[PDB]
Design a protein around this ligand. Structure first.
Ligand SMILES: CC(C)[C@@H](NC(=O)[C@H](CS)NC(=O)CCC[C@H](N)C(=O)O)C(=O)O
Ligand SMILES: [Fe+3]
Length: 329
């Protein structure tokens, strides 16, 4: 038998405003959620998630095999050695059901000094032909900035929750250098669904994606209305109920590092469900050289002996390790 995780709905709208006491009351709710199962739903977030879902579906359902090869990351197309992050992640019929499209900061252009310097984890986004996908790039770039704005407000809540001034995290989250990414993931309905695309957990549960901690400061996730996620607790995995009107929020392992595990990065996994659905995460990443000094809210002096960790190294190592452990997506 499988229990259900407590995932509170938090009205985050005060984080956009100037009522400081109301922001502290949101912060308390973020603190409680982060110390419990590690997840909450952000509601009253101001993003049109119906349009996000509609535009994403229109793209997933109209892109052709030829277009997928043209946009494919290096793991699927040897001609594209510069694409380790951004581009198309192909399905393999009979073997791999999931497919996705990842894009990064639109400000990463050939003019950007991190592209000029060839710094790892920075790439120029690739896009389908505008005439074949009218409005897609424009929608996707505006969405990046819409969810950036929500994430900046959520970061104010996390800072206040930890006893800091509201810009403690957000000051490192900037349009000119953020390594944040959007991934538009399609999980298809398939009949028959090939068993090769289904993994079996130690506890016997059929999975599409195994346990992991997120590589992020925080993760800001929209999913369509098909229950699939489970969070690990000491008493076992618990189902996270779906909510296609909100954003599911959690801390990633960079947050766990810098708080000395006070806000743990929750471990979750994806149950196998034979249903057409969408999983659209925004990974809130900082800049390549961002360093946040670790602290320990449990200690009166807040002292932590954990070493400061540069975000770029954290991200490069984390994304490689996640592929090694959980497979190329
Ligand atoms: C659990 C969800 C967040 C979603 N999973 C995911 O988003 C998956 C698996 S944890 N995420 C990743 O592998 C990291 C993607 C990083 C991205 N290419 C980038 O360059 O920044 C799903 O539905 O599988
Ligand atoms: Fe996760």
């Amino acid at each position: 038998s499988v229990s259900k995780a407590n995932v509170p709905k938090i009205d985050v709208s005060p984080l956009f405003g100037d009522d400081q006491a109301a922001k502290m009351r949101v912060a308390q709710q973020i603190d409680a959620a982060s110390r419990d199962t590690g997840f909450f739903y952000a509601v009253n977030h101001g993003i049109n998630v119906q349009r996000l879902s509609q535009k994403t579906k229109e793209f997933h359902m109209s892109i052709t095999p030829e277009e997928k090869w043209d946009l494919a990351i290096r793991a699927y197309n040897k001609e594209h050695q510069d694409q380790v992050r951004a581009g198309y992640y192909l399905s393999i019929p009979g073997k791999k059901a999931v497919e996705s499209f990842c894009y990064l900061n639109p400000n990463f252009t050939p003019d950007h000094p991190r592209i000029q310097a060839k710094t790892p984890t920075h790439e120029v986004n690739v896009w389908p032909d505008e005439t074949k996908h009218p409005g897609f790039q424009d929608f996707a770039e505006q969405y990046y900035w819409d969810v950036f704005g929500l994430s900046s407000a959520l970061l104010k809540g996390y800072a206040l929750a930890l006893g800091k001034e509201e810009n403690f995290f957000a000051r490192h989250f900037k349009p000119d250098d953020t390594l944040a990414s959007v991934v538009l993931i399609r999980y298809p309905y398939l009949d028959p669904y090939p068993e090769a695309a289904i993994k079996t957990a130690a506890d016997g549960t059929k999975l599409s994606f195994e346990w992991h901690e997120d590589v992020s400061l925080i993760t800001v996730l929209y999913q369509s209305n098909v229950q699939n996620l489970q969070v690990e607790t000491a008493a076992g995995y618990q189902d996270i109920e779906a909510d296609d009107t909100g954003y599911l929020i959690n801390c990633g392992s960079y947050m766990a590092h810098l708080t000395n595990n006070y806000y743990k990065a929750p471990i979750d996994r994806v149950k196998w469900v034979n249903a057409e659905r969408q999983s659209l995460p925004f990974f809130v990443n900082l800049g390549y050289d961002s360093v946040i000094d670790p602290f320990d809210p449990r200690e009166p002096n807040g002292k932590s002996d954990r070493e400061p960790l540069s975000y770029g190294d954290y991200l490069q190592n984390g994304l490689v390790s996640l592929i090694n452990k959980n497979g190329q997506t």
